[PDB]
Design a protein around this ligand. Sequence first.
Ligand SMILES: Nc1ncnc2c1ncn2[C@@H]1O[C@H](COP(=O)(O)OP(=O)(O)O)[C@@H](O)[C@H]1O
Ligand SMILES: Nc1ncnc2c1ncn2[C@@H]1O[C@H](COP(=O)(O)OP(=O)(O)O)[C@@H](O)[C@H]1O
Ligand SMILES: Nc1ncnc2c1ncn2[C@@H]1O[C@H](COP(=O)(O)OP(=O)(O)O)[C@@H](O)[C@H]1O
Ligand SMILES: [Mg+2]
Ligand SMILES: [Mg+2]
Ligand SMILES: [Mg+2]
Ligand SMILES: [Mg+2]
Lengths: 75, 105, 130, 535, 526, 98, 94, 364
Amino acid sequence: PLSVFGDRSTGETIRSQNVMAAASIANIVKSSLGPVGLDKMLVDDIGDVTITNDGATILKLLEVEHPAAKVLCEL
Amino acid sequence: GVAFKKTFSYAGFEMQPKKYHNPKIALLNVELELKAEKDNAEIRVHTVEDYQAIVDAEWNILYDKLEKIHHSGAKVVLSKLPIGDVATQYFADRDMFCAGRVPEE
Amino acid sequence: CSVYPLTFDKNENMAAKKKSVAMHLSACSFTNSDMQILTASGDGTCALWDVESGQLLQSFHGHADVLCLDLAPSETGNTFVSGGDKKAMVWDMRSGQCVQAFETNSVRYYPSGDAFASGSDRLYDLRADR
Amino acid sequence: ASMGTLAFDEYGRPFLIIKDQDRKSRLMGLEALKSHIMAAKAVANTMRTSLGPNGLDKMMVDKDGDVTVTNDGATILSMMDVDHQIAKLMVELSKSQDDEIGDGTTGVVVLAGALLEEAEQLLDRGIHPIRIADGYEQAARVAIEHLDKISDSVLVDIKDTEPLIQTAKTTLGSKVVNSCHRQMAEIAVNAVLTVADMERRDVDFELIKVEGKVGGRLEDTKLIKGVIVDKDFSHPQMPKKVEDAKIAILTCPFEPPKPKTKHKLDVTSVEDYKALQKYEKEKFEEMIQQIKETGANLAICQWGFDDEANHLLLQNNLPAVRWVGGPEIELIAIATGGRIVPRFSELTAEKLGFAGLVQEISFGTTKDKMLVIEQCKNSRAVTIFIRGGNKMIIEEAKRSLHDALCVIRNLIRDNRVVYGGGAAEISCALAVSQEADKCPTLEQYAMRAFADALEVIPMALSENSGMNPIQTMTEVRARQVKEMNPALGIDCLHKGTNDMKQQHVIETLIGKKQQISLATQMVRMILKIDDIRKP
Amino acid sequence: ASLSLAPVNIFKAGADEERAETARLTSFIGAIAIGDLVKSTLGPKGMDKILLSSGRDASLMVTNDGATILKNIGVDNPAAKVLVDMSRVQDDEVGDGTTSVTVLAAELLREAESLIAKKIHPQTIIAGWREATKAAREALLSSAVDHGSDEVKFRQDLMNIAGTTLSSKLLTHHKDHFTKLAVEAVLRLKGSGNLEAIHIIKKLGGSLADSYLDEGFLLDKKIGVNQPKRIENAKILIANTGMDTDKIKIFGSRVRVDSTAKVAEIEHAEKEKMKEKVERILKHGINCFINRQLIYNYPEQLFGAAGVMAIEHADFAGVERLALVTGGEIASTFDHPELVKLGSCKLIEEVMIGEDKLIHFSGVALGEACTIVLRGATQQILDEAERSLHDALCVLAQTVKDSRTVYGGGCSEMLMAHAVTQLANRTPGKEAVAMESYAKALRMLPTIIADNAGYDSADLVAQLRAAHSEGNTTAGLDMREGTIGDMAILGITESFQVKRQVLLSAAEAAEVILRVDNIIKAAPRK
Amino acid sequence: DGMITETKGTVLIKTAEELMNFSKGEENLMDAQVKAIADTGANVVVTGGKVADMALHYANKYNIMLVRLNSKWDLRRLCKTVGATALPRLTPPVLEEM
Amino acid sequence: RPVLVLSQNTKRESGRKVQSGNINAAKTIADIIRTCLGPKSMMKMLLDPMGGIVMTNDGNAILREIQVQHPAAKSMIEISRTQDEEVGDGTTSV
Amino acid sequence: TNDGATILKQMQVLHPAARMLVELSKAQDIEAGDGTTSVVIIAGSLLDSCTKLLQKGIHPTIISESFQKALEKGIEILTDMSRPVELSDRETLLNSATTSLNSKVVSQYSSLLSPMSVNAVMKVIDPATATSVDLRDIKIVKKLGGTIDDCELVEGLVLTQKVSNSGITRVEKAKIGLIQFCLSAPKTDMDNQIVVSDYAQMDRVLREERAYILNLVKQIKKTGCNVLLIQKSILRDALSDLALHFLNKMKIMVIKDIEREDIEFICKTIGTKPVAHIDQFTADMLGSAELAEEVNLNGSGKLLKITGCASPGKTVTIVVRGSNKLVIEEAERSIHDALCVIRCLVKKRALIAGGGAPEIELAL
Ligand SMILES: Nc1ncnc2c1ncn2[C@@H]1O[C@H](COP(=O)(O)OP(=O)(O)O)[C@@H](O)[C@H]1O
Ligand SMILES: Nc1ncnc2c1ncn2[C@@H]1O[C@H](COP(=O)(O)OP(=O)(O)O)[C@@H](O)[C@H]1O
Ligand SMILES: Nc1ncnc2c1ncn2[C@@H]1O[C@H](COP(=O)(O)OP(=O)(O)O)[C@@H](O)[C@H]1O
Ligand SMILES: [Mg+2]
Ligand SMILES: [Mg+2]
Ligand SMILES: [Mg+2]
Ligand SMILES: [Mg+2]
């Protein structure tokens, strides 16, 4: 009936999806917090290697698709 | 009590009365049909008299089973095995009810 | 589908004579008495032949095309069932008529004779037409 | 919202729960109800144009190209190729109404569609669907009680069939056989009354044989107090007409006997061959003489027979017919008052049936011959033989006659009737409205929606008849309220009056009650479904 | 909201529905297309059609019959299927009128389309058509004339009816000869309705005028080897016995001995049994013997030594026709020679027809069975001649059954239309418009008859309407030159049954199709 | 069930009396065997093969509990548990084998 | 409908496996040139991608001529290059 | 082929008008047998004229009626210009046959075929009584090899079946017997088996079968028969090897596998009444003949010819020979055309000039 060319998510589904995206982004960098934290070694699929602990660098290097996760990255 | 769907009545079934006020029910597991006596049975005769005797013997076997059922005083006959048209017409002639292929349950 | 070779490649075992002219085929089936052969074609006609004399006794047309033929062995004249149409048809060749029909490829006549299988791509009792 | 939830975990690892979950769909919550209501509304709106005397037929085509023109709602929905599950539920509802009653299979779908249409706007206002279903059930109980109150009884005696004929006419009015309306009603009433257990018991439809043949005219349809057969005399030279026939019903082929058990007869000498030949000839002669001994003038067999039996039957002035089917054998035995004899040795005179006339019937330039047995003494079986200008009107006449027979059967079961033409629905709507006023506020909306849905039948009747629906229905309802008369309906035929008693529009109470009950239960079932998990 | 025009999809893949206007459009288009196709083959100046089969056989068949034209066409429009079945049922009920009923139904549906375009409810059209059909049927019944009492008048009516039936067909070249042919063939039935008692034999070659009705009967079987080829004052015995390796009907029976001498004895016993069977057959005192089934070599030579013709493999139709023509009884047992009647005929001989040999039964006893030989230049000519002769025979048999006759040439159509117009002029409301459309179609039928001849159809129909309104109830189209004339004087008569059936069937099918307001198709297998 | 020949079974009937008496005699033999088994006091019968309809009917007549075990491992384990012996024929069990 | 948080081609590995893989890669990189240390070392023939041949026993040259995919191996190669640039000796030793 | 009917039949024409022209050719062949090309040419010319007739604005029915009138007038003219003939006038028949054979490939051989065709037609009918000729009485046998000059008119019967006997190929004063039963072990129509329970029964069965076959052969020989024709049999061996040995030992030629359809032709030719049971096999039921021998066609097959019969009843056989199969087919088609022309002369005793004279006269 809407006849909108696209996909629509409404209610608890979209809220749970946004929370899943945010939790996934958090879990990406949750292991690099505090002195007992450990670094991550990123590969740019062309052989480039980046070893870092900074959250901003990790989130900028990664390519993110979900927009609620982009919100946390730009945060 | 018990009630079940009608099970593939043969010819002559519609002439049987469909209501009884004190029936006796004969529960049987018997095939009341004209059929071979056994799967491996074989009849060897060399005279037309014996041929006619064999045919009449098959008919008499079926009719003896039917008469034994009838003389028991039962009015409703239910069988787990198929009941042929001959038996159905025989029971209709006696104002009796028949129903073959009744399920186990 | 099953066509035996031509020369029979034997030494006159009084069985090399086969007729097998095939003037009609999808359901060629020898009868109880070997004197008659029953065959069917895609024209919707069932043809009965006498193997000895070698001419069509009488053709049966009551159907579209007919596919499967099965015969109940009794003089080869009593009955034969055709299930080619979605119409199982039984014919009597003492009169040449469709004695009974069932509007419902691999029809099989039951050995008892009171029913027959109608496998398509059911046990139909002849005593009740159901 | 659709296809389910696709997360692939919050750690990036695969998250597979249901096999082929990427290829499956899912509708969650209120939108599922909206889709189901929309589908039911579409089905009901399709059906509603075939309601009443002015309804129009649907012309169905199956997968093989065969064409069926019909007004029967159950038949239309059965032949309709649907994929939506709610549409299948509507088809099952129509089939249920046909099975239980046999008439009103179109009204149930329209009523259910109207109920769900009202439930849609009730749901939009924030009411739980279970509450709507409960209110619908309460209003349905009220309507059933009101029908029981305003019902009227008719005489089901055979000495005065006028109310039965009127009821059958009301049933047949919407069908194409309204040209022969009175004759069709008369033959249906006579067919039901002739074969029926008089103590208000069941009517066995197995003893009403309905056969249709092309040619002739629709007015040529007649009720035969006997059996029509699609066979003829075996030998072409036997007489085509037998009067005062003494009938012998046999289930044994006129052939030499053979045991069922695997048997071999050994011929070991020329004397054995001569004995076998003499035995066969004497068997044929003996069976023919045994048949002739009972004094029968006609023989009916089931399993056919060969040439010698045919010539002996012809030679002894014994007309015979072969390959008569089992059901036809039973019908002949019932109608003619004769027994079924399994072999010649058991054939006696007392087992012979009687028929006043056995004849062979021609059908023009068609080569087809069909046997008729009639003029029986007290035949308990009847046959309806239908003629027409094409097969399609013949099938439509068959199902219309079935509707009439089912309606007369319903009268046999219960003799209470309610006048149709929308009067019953209007009175039920008025009763539901009056009951809703005393009801607390929360269920008032559901009961009012039920009343509005009930009022769609008069609106559909007015629409099909060209009248303005709302104005005509409002005027009839106001007249019903003003003067105490629950028999005021929609003047579909423009006879000049709204009172259905003078118009003799009569419906079975059982039919209306079944319609309302089935519609309410199906509407509740549809309202309770909130998820769909199609692949 | 429509079933198909909704966001929610309620159908399988390939299933579709057509609503009111679309269903009416498709039904009217199909019906009008069928009517236009079947027409132009109507009336004395109608033309034939070529039916090229697209299958493997690629059968070619030229014809003028409407039912045959409508049968062998791939039809997908459901209303076209309705009209095709109407034509088939009309052909089954009576021999003629297959084209007329289809044309009438098509014209009625075209008028219905116009009325719907004029914003008229189809129920009103149906009611008006029912009233008009009742009035027209009453008028046609009142106009019927019966001549079943006088034999000469009835024979003249049969002549005229056969001529009218054959006028439109390819036999119109020899209409007189073929009319005499068909009338004699039907009258030889002695009142029986058995059209299968008349056998039509199509032999290629020769002219169409060479066709004739054999004064006796012709069979297309063969005589035995040593049996005589010519018999005078024949005594016929028609049988339906085995006479070929005749085995006893006991089926578990078998020969089980311990030596070949006993096998030879049993074989000699079987041969002796067949010889005794042949002796029993011969004890009837017969010259000829026709068996439905085959006759093998041993009984064949027994008959040859007996000097008795043994015609074999005469099928059920063959033995029935022989019994009808010679009076013999089809027997299967021969233990009572005195209880079996024997057929008789003056002479049995073999004749040449083209390049084939046939058995001729001359000087038959009863003769209630006819053989008609058809000679033509092409196979299509032979088939069309057979179809036309079948039409004529069926109409003549129906006239024999019911002797009521009505005038043709559009006289009956114009009379019914005049009655319908008279009824409409006293009827208020749009039912009058529907009745006028009904009468317009009824008048359109002879208008199409006149169009097929290239005449001034409008002027002729106007003259016919004026004459019928004045009181000249027997005026009709005179196709000889193109004027109007007296059908009674000119002798264009035709069966009342045929016209009644045409009218009623056309009205019934038009009513059935008009009631349709929705067409729903399931997904086809293909 | 009633024992059958291991080579091939064929009932050769040459007179009507044999045809009318064969089934009755077979049923009587079944009844005699079942009653002989029951006369030892055995109120429970366990078999490793199929159960015939007539045998089941006659066992029901004499109030005998029937248990069928398809697996022969289960049969051997039951013999160990109860102390019985797996008879190869349908003869009544002796005192030690029951 | 491939809804995702990260890109489709993104691959993530963590835990003891990463440490074990890094250490094994470094060990195997060392094992490549383990035998080219000391006065009794052996030559190695390196087939340059541009068709040349590099025959040597210097650790830095051998490691530079090798292309690797594991990032730890790349780190070890960079370590060898740094050692060569800073002092010019001890690449194999380091 | 030069035959119009054959040419039109062999090529698959698709247009309906061509199909009806083919049917017209077939009908002309059936009724007459010659002029099959001329009738198609006439029909084509008639429709070609109909083109301009329709273009001028003439209704097709008027054209058909006028064509019917023209056909009646033309039939009258052709009947007027013809002359009567007598079947005793051999020169007219020879000229008709030669005219039939001029257009075919067998034209240099017409001096051989035309008298042969006339003799074949005359020998199978009665000129004083017959009103039609049954061409099935003239059997045509095609044998590859040689030249069309070697075509022969055989008065007796020609059989393509080979002699089962070896060493017997020529019998003079033959007594041909036609047999429709089987010379093998007895076998009833009913299913039959022989049950052996003792060792003596084995050789007793063998001896009894030998005695049965010997008795059959002796009964056949007692009648004086020396040439035996055995009808083709199925479901039972027509001629056993032991039966063949016994027949050979008594000097009897045996020819087996005779087709069922040829029984009538054989009986008409050599006057033998078929025998289906050994009980009815008698000398008076045999067919005498002057000579029955098997000849070889110069290493191109073998033919059995029975020439010279006591009762040569209205039957003749024609042997066609040639270098290749195509010329043999055309030669037999041309011979059939000549026979059909003589048949037409028999049916309608009227002769007309040729070479386009009737058509020019008709046009004028
Ligand atoms: N003569 C009439 N006048 C007014 N209403 C009628 C008349 N006949 C039938 N009806 C109404 O038409 C409705 C539809 O009936 P019908 O179409 O016959 O079967 P169904 O109820 O299955 O649609 C019924 O509810 C009935 O009340
Ligand atoms: N000689 C004639 N003169 C005038 N009208 C004729 C003549 N012959 C037939 N008709 C008319 O032609 C109509 C159609 O007849 P016909 O084409 O022969 O068969 P069908 O009814 O199958 O079309 C008939 O209604 C008849 O009135
Ligand atoms: N020698 C000839 N001289 C002139 N015309 C001939 C001669 N032979 C045949 N014709 C003509 O040739 C025509 C064709 O004859 P033919 O080809 O033999 O058979 P068809 O008539 O079937 O074509 C005949 O009409 C005949 O008049
Ligand atoms: Mg109704
Ligand atoms: Mg006509
Ligand atoms: Mg160093
Ligand atoms: Mg020529």
